[PDB]
Amino acid sequence: MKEAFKEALARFASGVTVVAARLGEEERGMTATAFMSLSLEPPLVALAVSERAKLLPVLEGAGAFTVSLLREGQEAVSEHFAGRPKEGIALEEGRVKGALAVLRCRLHALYPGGDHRIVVGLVEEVELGEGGPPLVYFQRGYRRLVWPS
Amino acid sequence: MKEAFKEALARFASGVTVVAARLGEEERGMTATAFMSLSLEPPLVALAVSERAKLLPVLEGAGAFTVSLLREGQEAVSEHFAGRPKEGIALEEGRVKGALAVLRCRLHALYPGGDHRIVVGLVEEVELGEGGPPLVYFQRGYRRLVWPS
């Protein structure tokens, strides 16, 4: 169903993130390409989280979450938090270690989004990893940017 | 201010779109990287439009808008609708001709977004251009994908 719509979306390239939240010792991570900057003042970002995602209840309960921007070569991390378990993949400090960047957010708002919820985060902390090319998703596959030396 | 936050966002790669709307005798196009798929059922997309964008009142009044996903080689189009005019660039049929895809949306909902407005569109029509690589923005510059792969 909705073949044309899906094809159009497959034509929007984007980085890949892992959104995570924790309540006590209960921690959940979820791969998401539906991420975008939203505001500078205040510093906000928005994401789309499935209404059926295990992450949602924990994120709402915690009132805070992190967003890790994956770098080139982190396909395993993306796959793991996408529901397809991989060996040796785990969150550290509530985020993905070695990511291009991590945004630690306070939950700012939740708005209706069809079969997804629009999650708005107020950025309170930023962690920057080493520079380099990103993990990209486009046309149903992981892609690399032209980034020569 | 917000140097680390801006750097983190510069590390999230994305395609580039031109959002447009028409009302009465006015029609405006605006370049935006803040776009993401939102829902399958109903078919929704979300975008962040500056609260001071000239496009906003037109889009609100029209109750409908288009989103064109730019392909590789359309940097001039992105620049033009970003506020840096380029010779001969203009919308055709309310969207960008030659784009990878065009989504004609009904304005579904709007939500506060700090210095931006969260705009949700319900996709009513999809126009698919001929297949090919996309225009990408990452690390404060236009990029290309290593394609095919």
From Swiss-Prot, chains A, B:
Keywords: Aromatic hydrocarbons catabolism, FAD, Flavoprotein, FMN, NAD, Oxidoreductase. One of its GO terms (molecular function) is flavin reductase (NADH) activity. This is 4-hydroxyphenylacetate 3-monooxygenase, reductase component. One of its GO terms (biological process) is pyrimidine nucleobase catabolic process. NAD(+) binds at residues 37, 116, 137-140. Pathway: Aromatic compound metabolism; 4-hydroxyphenylacetate degradation; pyruvate and succinate semialdehyde from 4-hydroxyphenylacetate: step 1/7. It catalyses: a reduced flavin + NAD(+) = an oxidized flavin + NADH + 2 H(+). FAD binds at residues 27-34, 48-50, 54-55, 80. It comes from the Bacteria. Disulfide bonds: none annotated. The keyword Amino-acid biosynthesis does not apply. Belongs to the non-flavoprotein flavin reductase family. HpaC subfamily. It comes from Thermus thermophilus (strain ATCC 27634 / DSM 579 / HB8). The keyword Glycoprotein does not apply. Signal peptide: none annotated. Catalyzes the reduction of free flavins (FMN, FAD and riboflavin) by NADH. Subsequently, the reduced flavins diffuse to the large HpaB component. It utilizes NADH, but not NADPH as an electron donor, and both FAD and FMN as electron acceptors. Its EC number is 1.5.1.36. It is an enzyme of class 1 (oxidoreductase). Homodimer. 4-HPA 3-monooxygenase consists of a reductase component HpaC and an oxygenase component HpaB.
